[PDB]
Amino acid sequence: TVRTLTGKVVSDKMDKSIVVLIERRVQHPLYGKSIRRSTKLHAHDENNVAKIGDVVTIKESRPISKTKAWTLVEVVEAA
Amino acid sequence: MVVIRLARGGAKKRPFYQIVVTDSRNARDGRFIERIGFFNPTAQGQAEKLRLDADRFAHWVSQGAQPSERVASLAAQAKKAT
Amino acid sequence: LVEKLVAVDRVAKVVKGGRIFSFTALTVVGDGNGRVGFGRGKAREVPAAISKALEAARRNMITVDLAGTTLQHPVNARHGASRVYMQPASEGTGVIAGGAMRAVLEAAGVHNVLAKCYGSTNAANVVNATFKGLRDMTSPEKVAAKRGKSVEEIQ
Amino acid sequence: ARYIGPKCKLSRREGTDLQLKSGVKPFDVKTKKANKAPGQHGQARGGKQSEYSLQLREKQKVRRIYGVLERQFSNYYKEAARVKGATGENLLKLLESRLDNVVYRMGFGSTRAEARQLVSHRSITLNGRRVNIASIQVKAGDVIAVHEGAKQQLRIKNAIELAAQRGIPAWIEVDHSKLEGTFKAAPDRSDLPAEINESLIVELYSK
Amino acid sequence: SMQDTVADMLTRVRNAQMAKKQTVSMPSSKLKVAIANVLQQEGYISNVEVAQEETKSTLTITLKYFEGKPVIEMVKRVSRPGLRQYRGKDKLPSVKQGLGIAIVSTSKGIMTDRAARAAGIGGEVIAFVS
Amino acid sequence: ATTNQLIRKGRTTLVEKSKVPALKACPQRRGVCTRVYTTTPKKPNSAMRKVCRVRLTSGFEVSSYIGGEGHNLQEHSVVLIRGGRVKDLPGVRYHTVRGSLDCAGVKDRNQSRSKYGAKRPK
RNA sequence: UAGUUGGUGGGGUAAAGGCCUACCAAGGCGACGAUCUGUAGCGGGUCUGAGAGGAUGAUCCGCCACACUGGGACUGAGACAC
RNA sequence: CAGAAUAAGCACCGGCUAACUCUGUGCCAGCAGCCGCGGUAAUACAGAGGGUGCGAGCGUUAAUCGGAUUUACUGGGCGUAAAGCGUGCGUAGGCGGCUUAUUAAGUCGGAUGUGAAAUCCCCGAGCUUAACUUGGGAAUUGCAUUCGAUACUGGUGAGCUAG
């Protein structure tokens, strides 16, 4: 039951890596308005299957580099 | 090692002990793993003197914990009581 | 009948050679069972002003629908720059309010309420605001009647 | 501590008889100055008073009759507020349930002050214990008895004579020959006199 | 531009009541129809009609007066596009100590606060009426 | 403001400064008298009031009013000062406490003695 | 921001990892506040308040860092050791 | 066993604020949190009498919150009191007309795990009472996983004409 997060690829320049932008929607602690929030996560894709614009799913893993600790699972939607 | 012993509490001249399972390196009245009873040396009236949980006592003793001498004596007292 | 002297004040007008000085009085009169009124009276003497205020308050009266010794629902009222909030309270709380609001509430007959004043605390305006709020309070029976439903259905 | 001072000055100031003179003569005959305050500027009771003034005089009136200082009175009021039910009535129940006041209402003390001294000197016993605190609250079912040393006392004999002259309250039942009585429950508000007003005190503390 | 049709409908009802008119007409939508049906079933308004010509539908509401006064004394919009209000079952609002109604959008449909409490569900608070 | 405006920027709260900066959040302060003088109150009051210039341990030279009928303070006197405003002498924001390190209580007083430091006369 | 961001071979650690190193590529972060600068041990709790909130971290408990100032290792299950 | 024998001070009395008079003194001495009092009949200055409120304590200074709806989420304002940019266009952002199908992100409901102990509150027990100590419960208003609902908001496909 690995934790899974779905996002969309935003970069593919690096070798065997992709960068995916993940967005969440939460209420403001004081005023209650629903507001947008986003985070950028580095992932590992050995075969360079994913590219910029596609929707992907990633899971948590052991560290693979200084900044990468997530791995590709499937390409949900091809660009 | 893991031990079962008495942590002090209450007021001056009238201590009240918690029977706790803890790592021997922790302080007497500090960090502990589990609380499994109490001991009131000067109980009077309706106050209960000794309450020890035999199931947890046996479990921890089986897991390698070493009781102190006072706790062993109290466990013997509780065994006689029940 | 319960009679309360909310306030008395000294006022002046300018004339040749000096000042003409008079007194004004604000008073409230009620029965304690749910009828209340307030009035103002002016005169060159306090005894006369108070009496005129008493007559004015007697003339200006209304009826109020109470819930035992408390209000039917929380109420917000205003007159000019004076705002008043009143909330029903459980038995034993008492009347937690200011003097101006307390006079009107005692005259009406409410003995359990929590009241707050926001804005100007002018005695006459606060009395007017409390008066209008108490007058405009509704009741479960009236709400059911105007909705066309039963009181039990209204709950 | 305790308030040691003239009693009739305070009684006249309060405007009503506080019942601190044992009632052997009429209070009016004893003081012959009621309705006039003690002082150079003492004025008749008809003088007007402020709202805060009345609120304060009510608390002072209760405190003077029951011999309780301000700190203990405030603790009593806070306790009554915590306790469920009408806070004003609970406060009066708390005052009535005092060991020395219960001894007075049970009839072995000529005055509440005398009962205080009896308790302090250990001439009274709660159940089988030689208590010496007047602030003790007597719970339901308690037995206020006299001590052997306290028995065979001329003061106690005169006190029981005065009690017989008086009327024993219903909730207490005391055998004078055995010099011991028992407490059923807290006297009800209806039983308590209607002269005292508690709402003024509740507002005083609420302010 | 127009951005809150529910608020527009509530405002039209309020101003018609204040002007003492017997009927009020407006462009129709299914959400407005649901709100009007809830008001009618709670007794604030008499009748609700929808009339379609080619593709445009008009909602018509009949208003009630009692004792020479509007039956709807107070109507307020709670949740707006700028700020959206969602409440759980425990924290549902009460209007005038239960003498009014709070209209609630829940997964089971549009209902009042007391009915929502009975069902043990929450949702979006739309309006207060009394 | 609107909800969006409040989200983008919040509500601003402004702090308040201390009316007694010389004390530096202390109930009292030791000092050394630098000059004892008598000044004239501002209108409409007319009188002569005794003030002193003091170098505090904190480091701020300050003016201290002296209360009571009689004062024996002179140059090079170690005194103790506290908060308090005369309300009619500009620039005076402190009092000197009597009965302190070098100050003495006021003689021939029997009312409000705890103030002015006079001890109990028999 | 130029070991900087990622990859391959090798080194190293009880253990993942630019942790180190040779080469390869030009990446990586930032208006959702990067970089710089000021201030500060953090939580359970405590005070105040109808509540929302505001102020706060003595005494009790958990975690962190430090031992005249700075740089180091040794021994040992465990220290870079009042 | 001895005997009332060993034991009560501090502040205040013009209004806010419960308690007033005499003397001495006079725009001096002085009092003063604010409005203020003081040039010979000052209940506001010093003493005295009498009182008032506390009490082994009573006053002052220092500091935080409250009153303060004077930072307003709950819960404020911009014609003349403080406050609409000299006027447009437009980027990021916020919000956005009607119908229908699908999704279940927001939203809502259920279950499991977790939210240490102490502290707060509730019912009891031991302290002559109370403080205090203590047994149990509630609470910890949150976070995570999972299974469900589809009215509203958002995503997707399709259709429409009042913008």
In the 3-class helix/strand/coil scheme, how is chain D assigned residue by residue?
CCCCCCCHHHHHHHCCCCCCCCCCCCHHHHHCCCCECCCCCCCECCCCCCHHHHHHHHHHHHHHHHCCCHHHHHHHHHHHHHCCCCHHHHHHHHHHCEHHHHHHHHCCCCCHHHHHHHHHCCCEEECCECCCCCCCECCCCCEEEECCCCCCCHHHHHHHHHHHHCCCCCCEEEECCCCEEEECCCCCCCCCCCCCCCHHHHHHHHC
Residues C130, C72 share a domain: yes
CA distance D143 to C17: 84
Radius of gyration of chain A (CA): 14
β-strands C18-30, B14-15 pairing: unpaired
Same domain assignment for residues C89 and C28: no
Which of C45, C148, C149, C129 is closest to C85 using CA atoms?
C129
CB atoms within 10 A of CB E115: 16
C69 with C53, same domain? no
Q: Residue D61: how many CB atoms within 10 A of its CB?
A: 21
Residues 6+ apart with CB under 8 A from E28: E50, E57, E58, E59
Measured between beta carbons, which residues in chain E are less than 8 angstroms from residue A31?
A: 83
How many other C-beta atoms lie within 10 A of the C-beta of residue C7?
17
Range of the domain at E118: 73-130
Q: Which residue shows structure tokens 């209760």? A: D62
**Do E66 and E86 reside in the same domain of the chain?**
no
**D75 domain residue, yes or no:** yes
- Other Cβ atoms less than 10 A from the Cβ of E75: the count is 18
Same domain, D78 and D25: yes
Calpha distance C26→E58 (Å, rounded): 56
Minimal CA–CA distance to E16: which of E5, E26, E24, E8? E24
Whether residue D135 lies inside any domain: the answer is yes
Q: Is residue E118 within a helix (H) or strand (E), and if so which, with residue range?
A: helix E113-119
Measuring alpha carbon to C1', the residue closest to nucleotide H68 is C118
Question: To 10 degrees, the CA torsion angle through D8, D9, D13, D14?
Answer: -40
Q: What Å value separates CA F84 and C1' G57?
A: 31
Whether the Cβ atoms of residue D144 and residue D124 lie closer than 8 Å to each other: yes
Same domain, E91 and E116: yes
The radius of gyration computed from the CA coordinates of chain E, to the nearest angstrom, equals 15
Which residues sit opposite E52 in a β-bridge?
Answer: E57
Rounded Cα–Cα distance for residues C22 and C47 (Å): 12
How many angstroms separate the CA atoms of D130 and D122, rounded?
6
C-alpha C99/C-alpha F54 separation (Å) is 49
Handedness of CA D115, D116, D121, D123 (dihedral sign): positive
User: CA of F16, closest CA in chain A: separation in Å?
Assistant: 25
| Cα–Cα distance list, D144 to C24, C143, D68, D105, D165 (Å) | 63, 60, 21, 11, 20
Return positions of chain H under 7 A from a protein CB: 4, 8-12, 16-21, 27-38, 46-63, 69, 71-73, 76-77, 93-100, 105-110, 116-117, 121-122, 125-129, 132-135, 145-146, 148-153, 160-163
C63 DSSP β-pair partners? C35
Nearest CA in chain A to F4: A33
Separation between Cα atoms, residue F73 and residue F36, nearest integer Å? 8
Which amino acid type is present at position C32?
A: G
Torsion, CA E32, CA E35, CA E37, CA E40, rounded to 10: -120
C-alpha C135/C-alpha A6 separation (Å) is 61
Residue D21 lies in domain:
7-95+192-206
Whether the CA torsion C11, C13, C18, C20 is positive or negative: it is: negative
Helix (H) / strand (E) element for E69: namely strand E69-70
Residue F51 has phi, psi (to 5 degrees) of: -130, 165
Residue C120 falls inside a structural domain? yes
Co-location of E87 and E54 in the same domain: no
Q: Is C122 found in the same domain as C73?
A: yes
Residues E66, E83, single domain; the answer is: no
Which of these, E37, E35, E38, E60, lies nearest to E49 by C-alpha position? E60
Whether residue D29 is found in the same domain as residue D51 = yes
Question: Which chain C residue's Cα is nearest to D51?
Answer: C99
Residues 6+ apart with CB under 8 A from C127: C6, C26, C28, C38, C100, C101, C103, C104
How many domains does one find in chain C? 2
Distance CA D142, CA D102 (A): 11
CB contact (8 A) between residue F6 and residue A31: yes
Same domain, D78 and D132: no
d(CA D47, CA D26): 25
What are the distances in angstroms from CA E109 to CA A17, E22, E112? 47, 29, 10
For position D130, which CATH number holds?
Answer: 3.10.290.10
Closest nucleotide (CA of D79 to C1')? H130
Q: Are residues D116 and D137 in the same domain?
A: yes
In this structure, are D85 and D100 located in the same domain? no
Domain that holds residue C122: 63-147
Task: Please check whether residues D86 and D145 belong to one and the same domain.
Answer: no
Question: F28: closest CA among F65, F79, F87?
Answer: F79
Q: Are residues C110 and C90 in the same domain?
A: yes
CA-nearest of F37, F114, F118 to F73 is: F37
Residues C138 and C93 in one domain: yes
User: Rg of chain D over CA atoms, in angstroms?
Assistant: 18
Residues C68 and C58 in one domain: no
In a domain, D1, yes or no: no
Residues 6+ apart with CB under 8 A from C145: E66
Distances (CA, A) of C71 to C78, C96, E72: 17, 13, 21
Token pair belonging to D86: 């009408």
Residues D128, D76, single domain; the answer is no
d(CA D128, CA D65): 29
Do E78 and E127 have their domain in common?
yes
State how many domains chain E has. Answer: 2
For residues A27 and A39, what is the distance between their CA atoms, to the nearest angstrom?
A: 17
Q: CB–CB of F95/F65 below 8 Å? A: yes
Per DSSP, the three-state class of E86 is strand
- How far, in Å, CA of C111 to CA of D11, rounded? 31
Q: Which residue is nearest to the C1' sugar atom of H43, using CA?
A: D41
> Where residue C135 sits, what CATH number does that domain have?
3.30.230.10
Interface contact C114, partner D, CB < 8 A: no
Residue pointed to by tokens 């509740």: D202
Q: Kindly report the CA angle at A42 between A37 and A47, in degrees rounded to 5? A: 135
Contact A38/A5 with Cβ under 8 angstroms? Answer: no
Cα C87 from Cα B41, distance rounded (Å): 54
- Single residue among C46, C62, C78 that ends a domain in this structure: C62
Task: Show me where the domains of chain B are located.
Answer: 1-82
Residue E5 has what DSSP assignment? Answer: H
Q: How far apart are CA F33 and CA F81, in angstroms?
A: 11
What nucleotides of chain G have any atom within 7 angstroms of a protein Cβ? 5-8, 16-19, 26-30, 32, 53, 60-63
**E61 and E122 assigned to the same domain:** no
Whether residue E89 contacts residue E121, with contact meaning beta carbons closer than 8 Å, is answered with yes
What six digits make up the tokens of B30? 């500090």
* D1-D6-D9 Cα angle (round to 5): 125
Q: How would you label E39-69 residue by residue, b for 16+ Cβ within 10 Å and e otherwise?
A: beebbbbeebeeeeeeeeeebebebbeeeee
CA distances from B4 to B38, B62, B74 (A): 12, 12, 12
A64 touches strand G (CB under 7 A): yes
Helix (H) or strand (E) holding B74: helix B69-81
Amino acid sitting at position C20: I
**Strand duo E109-112 + E101-106: pairing:** antiparallel
C115 shares its domain with C80: yes
Token pair for residue A58? 């990633």
DSSP F81-93: EEE---SSSTT--
Cis peptide before E81 (omega within 30 of 0): no
Q: How far is CA C6 from CA C27, C54, C111, C118, C126, in A?
A: 5, 11, 18, 19, 11
Can you name the residues that pair with B5 across neighbouring β-strands?
A: B20
Residues C78 and C52 in one domain: no
**Pair of tokens at residue D184:** 């059923």
B63 vs D95: CA distance, rounded Å = 59
Nearest C-alpha neighbor of F32 from the set F83, F96, F92, F91: F96
Residue C152 in any domain: the answer is no
Do residues D18 and D64 lie in contact, with contact meaning Cβ atoms separated by under 8 Å?
yes
CA gap F52, F76 in Å, rounded = 11
What is the rounded distance in angstroms from the CA atom of residue E110 to the CA atom of residue E30? 11
- Do E101 and E55 share a domain, yes or no? no
The C1' atom of H122 and the CA atom of C40 lie apart, in whole Å, by 53
How far is it, in rounded angstroms, from Cα B65 to Cα D69? 57
Burial of residue B75 (number of CB atoms within 10 Å: 0-12, 13-18, 19+) = buried
Question: Are C62 and C131 a contacting pair, CB within 8 Å?
Answer: yes
d(CA C60, CA C127): 13
Query: Is C103 among the domain residues?
Result: yes
Per-residue 3-state assignment (H helix, E strand, C coil) for chain C? CEEEEEEEEEEEEEECCEEEEEEEEEEEEECCCCEEEEEEEEECCHHHHHHHHHHHHHHCEEECCCECCECCCCEEEEECCEEEEEEECCCCCCEECCHHHHHHHHHHCCCCEEEEEEECCCHHHHHHHHHHHHHHCCCHHHHHHHHCCCHHHHC
How many domains, chain D?
A: 2
Under an 8 A CB cutoff, do E85 and A32 touch?
A: yes
Shared-domain flag, residues E80 and E57: no
Q: Are B7 and B70 in contact (CB under 8 A)?
A: no
Reference F103, options F73, F69, F66; nearest CA is: F73
Round to whole Å and give the CA distance between C127 and A46. 80
Amino acid occupying residue C75: V
